[PDB]
Scaffold this motif. Structure first.
Motif, PDB file in Angstrom:
ATOM      1  N   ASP A  93      44.495  39.197  30.453  1.00 51.91           N
ATOM      2  CA  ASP A  93      43.584  38.210  31.011  1.00 51.91           C
ATOM      3  C   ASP A  93      44.200  36.814  30.993  1.00 51.91           C
ATOM      4  OD1 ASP A  93      40.452  36.718  30.116  1.00 51.91           O
ATOM      5  OD2 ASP A  93      41.100  37.403  32.108  1.00 51.91           O
ATOM      6  N   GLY A  94      44.362  36.218  32.170  1.00 52.74           N
ATOM      7  CA  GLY A  94      44.896  34.872  32.274  1.00 52.74           C
ATOM      8  C   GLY A  94      46.409  34.796  32.431  1.00 52.74           C
ATOM      9  N   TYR A  95      47.079  35.943  32.487  1.00 50.76           N
ATOM     10  CA  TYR A  95      48.531  35.927  32.661  1.00 50.76           C
ATOM     11  C   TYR A  95      48.885  35.589  34.112  1.00 50.76           C
ATOM     12  CZ  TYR A  95      53.440  37.322  32.744  1.00 50.76           C
ATOM     13  OH  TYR A  95      54.801  37.367  32.946  1.00 50.76           O
ATOM     14  N   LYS A  96      49.777  34.611  34.273  1.00 57.51           N
ATOM     15  CA  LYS A  96      50.172  34.067  35.574  1.00 57.51           C
ATOM     16  C   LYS A  96      51.682  33.839  35.595  1.00 57.51           C
ATOM     17  CE  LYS A  96      45.701  31.822  36.238  1.00 57.51           C
ATOM     18  NZ  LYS A  96      44.956  30.546  36.350  1.00 57.51           N
ATOM     19  N   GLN A  97      52.406  34.742  34.944  1.00 55.85           N
ATOM     20  CA  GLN A  97      53.865  34.741  34.973  1.00 55.85           C
ATOM     21  C   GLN A  97      54.424  33.470  34.330  1.00 55.85           C
ATOM     22  OE1 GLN A  97      51.949  35.561  38.049  1.00 55.85           O
ATOM     23  NE2 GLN A  97      51.860  37.482  36.888  1.00 55.85           N
ATOM     24  N   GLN A  98      53.709  32.991  33.314  1.00 52.86           N
ATOM     25  CA  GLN A  98      54.165  31.877  32.489  1.00 52.86           C
ATOM     26  C   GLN A  98      55.506  32.243  31.883  1.00 52.86           C
ATOM     27  OE1 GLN A  98      51.038  33.198  32.330  1.00 52.86           O
ATOM     28  NE2 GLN A  98      49.472  31.597  32.019  1.00 52.86           N
ATOM     29  N   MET A 140      45.967  45.408  35.398  1.00 56.94           N
ATOM     30  CA  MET A 140      45.011  44.394  35.829  1.00 56.94           C
ATOM     31  C   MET A 140      43.812  44.994  36.567  1.00 56.94           C
ATOM     32  SD  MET A 140      46.430  41.511  34.730  1.00 56.94           S
ATOM     33  CE  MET A 140      45.835  40.093  35.657  1.00 56.94           C
ATOM     34  N   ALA A 141      43.845  46.304  36.816  1.00 55.13           N
ATOM     35  CA  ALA A 141      42.787  46.962  37.588  1.00 55.13           C
ATOM     36  C   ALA A 141      41.408  46.745  36.970  1.00 55.13           C
ATOM     37  CB  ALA A 141      43.072  48.454  37.718  1.00 55.13           C
ATOM     38  N   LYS A 185      45.032  41.625  41.271  1.00 57.94           N
ATOM     39  CA  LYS A 185      46.136  42.350  41.889  1.00 57.94           C
ATOM     40  C   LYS A 185      47.310  42.540  40.923  1.00 57.94           C
ATOM     41  CE  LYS A 185      47.703  39.694  45.312  1.00 57.94           C
ATOM     42  NZ  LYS A 185      48.591  38.792  46.110  1.00 57.94           N
ATOM     43  N   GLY A 186      48.080  43.594  41.160  1.00 56.93           N
ATOM     44  CA  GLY A 186      49.270  43.864  40.381  1.00 56.93           C
ATOM     45  C   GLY A 186      50.386  42.897  40.720  1.00 56.93           C
ATOM     46  N   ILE A 187      50.992  42.319  39.689  1.00 56.24           N
ATOM     47  CA  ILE A 187      52.093  41.382  39.857  1.00 56.24           C
ATOM     48  C   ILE A 187      53.156  41.737  38.827  1.00 56.24           C
ATOM     49  CG2 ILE A 187      52.774  38.957  39.915  1.00 56.24           C
ATOM     50  CD1 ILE A 187      49.901  38.259  40.498  1.00 56.24           C
ATOM     51  N   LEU A 188      54.425  41.593  39.186  1.00 58.38           N
ATOM     52  CA  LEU A 188      55.496  41.893  38.235  1.00 58.38           C
ATOM     53  C   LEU A 188      55.505  40.897  37.072  1.00 58.38           C
ATOM     54  CD1 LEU A 188      58.347  42.854  40.723  1.00 58.38           C
ATOM     55  CD2 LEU A 188      57.151  44.368  39.147  1.00 58.38           C
ATOM     56  N   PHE A 189      55.684  41.417  35.862  1.00 58.49           N
ATOM     57  CA  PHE A 189      55.897  40.603  34.665  1.00 58.49           C
ATOM     58  C   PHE A 189      57.324  40.043  34.681  1.00 58.49           C
ATOM     59  CE2 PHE A 189      57.207  39.909  30.320  1.00 58.49           C
ATOM     60  CZ  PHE A 189      56.097  39.416  29.666  1.00 58.49           C
TER      61      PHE A 189
END
Ligand SMILES: CNCC[C@H](Oc1ccc(C(F)(F)F)cc1)c1ccccc1
Ligand SMILES: [Cl-]
Ligand SMILES: [Zn+2]
Length: 209
Positions: free
Chosen positions: A45-50, A83-84, A89-93
């Motif tokens: 939750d809240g991950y945005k590729q930081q 993230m489902a 949406k699915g995004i690469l880490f």
């Protein structure tokens, strides 16, 4: 297996040792170098590729799900966090750094193979020590520890210095070699390893390995 492995730190401390202060400062300094920010992983939750992911207060006895996720994150495999359930949406880490802290002397994974897999991934594995002057009742003194140093200090990875930065209040001890670092020195080490992993020389070397 096209992703550069994140550079990973594990800090072992005690509940009042300022473990989370340390990961926050190390993390922010590293993140700023990459024009980014820190993300604390809720135990995505809240991950945005930081650029920096922090895992604070790892339990001593992770289960198989903990181990599996961590070994995905810290590796060269493409990894899409789940993230489902959040209807996102699915995004690469892609975070190049993972910092963790624990009150455990030693992490014990379910199997010894699991333990080897974790050891392989915690590139920097350090004990925190709080200096006695800056600790009362087993709790680090933050007012004391954040007070700006005089001009005998000129930090490398921070705009100003305080005892948290230059090793007056907290120090980091390599668990294998007992080599000691200030927080500032540890940031320098972590960014050097990042630069090593991302260099042309290193990446081209992998074509022959
Ligand atoms: C569900 N079990 C406890 C939660 C979990 O604890 C962990 C403990 C150890 C590890 C590992 F595997 F060592 F990295 C990973 C996670 C944790 C702690 C802090 C942040 C994310 C996850
Ligand atoms: Cl095993
Ligand atoms: Zn200082």
């Amino acid at each position: 297996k096209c992703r550069i492995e994140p550079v990973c730190l594990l800090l072992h401390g005690s509940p009042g040792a300022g473990k989370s202060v340390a990961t926050n400062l190390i993390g922010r300094s590293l993140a700023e170098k990459l024009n980014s920010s820190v993300y604390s992983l809720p135990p995505f939750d809240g991950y945005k590729q930081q650029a920096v992911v922090i895992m604070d207060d790892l339990c001593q006895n992770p289960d198989g799900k903990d181990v599996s996720l961590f070994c995905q994150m810290v590796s060269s495999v493409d990894f899409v966090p789940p993230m489902a359930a959040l209807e996102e949406k699915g995004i690469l880490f892609t975070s190049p750094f993972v910092l963790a802290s624990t009150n455990a002397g030693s992490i014990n994974a379910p199997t010894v193979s699991d333990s080897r897999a974790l050891a392989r991934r915690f590139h920097f594995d350090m004990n925190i020590e709080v200096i006695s002057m800056y600790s009362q009742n087993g709790k680090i003194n933050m007012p004391m520890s954040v007070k700006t140093c005089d001009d005998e200090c000129c930090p490398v990875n921070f705009k100003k210095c305080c005892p948290l930065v230059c090793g007056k209040a907290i120090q980091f001890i390599d668990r294998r070699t007992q080599v000691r670092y200030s927080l500032d020195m540890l940031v320098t080490e972590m960014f050097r390893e990042y630069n090593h992993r991302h260099s042309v020389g290193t990446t081209l070397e992998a074509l022959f390995q």
